[PDB]
Design a protein around this ligand. Structure first.
Ligand SMILES: NC(=O)C1=CN([C@@H]2O[C@H](COP(=O)(O)OP(=O)(O)OC[C@H]3O[C@@H](n4cnc5c(N)ncnc54)[C@H](OP(=O)(O)O)[C@@H]3O)[C@@H](O)[C@H]2O)C=CC1
Length: 340
């Protein structure tokens, strides 16, 4: 343990802050990449206010993961890094050019991190890539409803199909960033081992603080848009799929470098099906002070699970992780409790 030093790219993001929190709670020396000095100081202050050992956390400034050589200076300054958690990637549909704002920042950010690790991360033994269930199952025209998917399945979406719209663009960004790692391992044959963490829709509370209660990270807006509709008058879009709580995703990233069976594995981080209506049901029962303000969901606008969703078999992932997942009710409750 004392010899382990974990680097986390994009440390201010939703999942990454929970990873950083989980690492510090476990006592790991942690180095977080951030886009600015003020973002680094902000995260250090959150860590200190939470009562954690902030001497365990340092930050490096990496303004743009997409820039060639992005992580070079950081790893040069930190030759003690033995684990690299590459989590940073655009996770938003608030973009206009898929290719410029999703594909290449994801793909080249990832290729640049790997080149930086191989050249300046001489002590890195384990690399963990935050991928996505998006790389595992097909979507929209490529949906395979009722077909089993598991840790070995791939989304067949082509590069050109990813260009169609921002949702498919994000999906393709994850599939092709992941393919880029596998191809890098084949071509460069690095000495480090790789593990992938592939989460479905990630729900749950922020690690330390809600910056702006009006708008959370993109996946948690599935919850928050039900809360803010009363004020914004914006009809909430309804979703169906699989969910996972952010704290299980964060724990999975530690398992990913702590265990030997995870080498070369894609950990499929999916708990159970969800729908927007089912989340609304949890909210109205668990927070009666909110039923006054919750929207009336048009059942005709609701995606039906059986029409689109593959059937996840992640028994292997579940065995390797070895802990019980947080269920949807707790995940939603804990998210709301930070907003109410
Ligand atoms: N949330 C989900 O449901 C899922 C998320 N994922 C993956 O998890 C990871 C984090 O997602 P999440 O935490 O949800 O989303 P967030 O938007 O909360 O975090 C995104 C992070 O990426 C950083 N980032 C984006 N572009 C750049 C760039 N060009 N240079 C440097 N930093 C950059 C942001 O930096 P800053 O903080 O400075 O903006 C932020 O830290 C992503 O790889 C995402 O694809 C995978 C499956 C599902």
């Amino acid at each position: 343990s004392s010899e382990t030093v974990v680097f986390v790219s994009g440390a201010t993001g939703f999942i990454a802050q929970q990873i950083v929190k989980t690492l510090l709670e476990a006592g790991y020396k942690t180095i977080g990449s951030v886009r600015s000095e003020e973002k680094g100081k902000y995260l250090k202050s959150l860590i200190e206010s939470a009562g954690l050992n902030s001497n365990l956390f340092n930050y490096v400034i990496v303004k743009d993961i997409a820039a060639k050589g992005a992580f070079n200076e950081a790893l040069q300054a930190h030759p003690e890094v033995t684990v690299f958690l590459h989590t940073a990637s655009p996770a938003t549909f608030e973009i206009h050019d898929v290719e410029k704002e999703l594909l290449k920042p994801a793909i080249e950010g990832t290729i640049n991190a790997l080149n930086a690790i191989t050249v300046y991360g001489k002590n890195v033994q384990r690399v963990v890539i935050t991928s996505s269930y998006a790389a595992v199952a097909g979507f929209a025209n490529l949906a395979t409803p009722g077909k089993e998917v598991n840790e070995e399945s791939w989304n067949p979406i082509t590069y050109e199909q990813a260009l169609e719209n921002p949702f498919l663009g994000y999906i393709g960004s994850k599939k092709f960033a992941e393919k880029a790692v596998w191809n890098y391992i084949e071509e460069k044959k690095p000495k480090w081992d790789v593990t992938f963490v592939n989460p479905a829709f990630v729900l749950g509370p922020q690690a330390f603080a809600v910056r702006d209660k009006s708008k959370l990270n993109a996946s948690n807006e599935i919850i928050n848009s039900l809360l803010t509709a009363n004020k914004t008058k914006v009809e909430p879009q309804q979703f169906v799929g699989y969910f996972i709580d952010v704290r299980d995703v964060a724990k999975a990233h530690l398992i990913a470098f702590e265990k030997n069976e995870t080498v070369g594995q894609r950990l499929l981080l999916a708990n159970a099906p969800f729908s927007s209506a089912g989340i609304l049901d949890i909210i109205e029962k668990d927070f009666p002070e909110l039923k006054s303000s919750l929207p009336k969901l048009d059942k005709s606008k609701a995606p039906k699970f059986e029409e689109t969703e593959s059937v996840v078999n992640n028994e292997k992932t579940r065995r390797i992780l070895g802990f019980k997942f947080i269920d949807l009710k707790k995940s939603v409750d804990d998210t709301i409790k930070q907003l109410v």
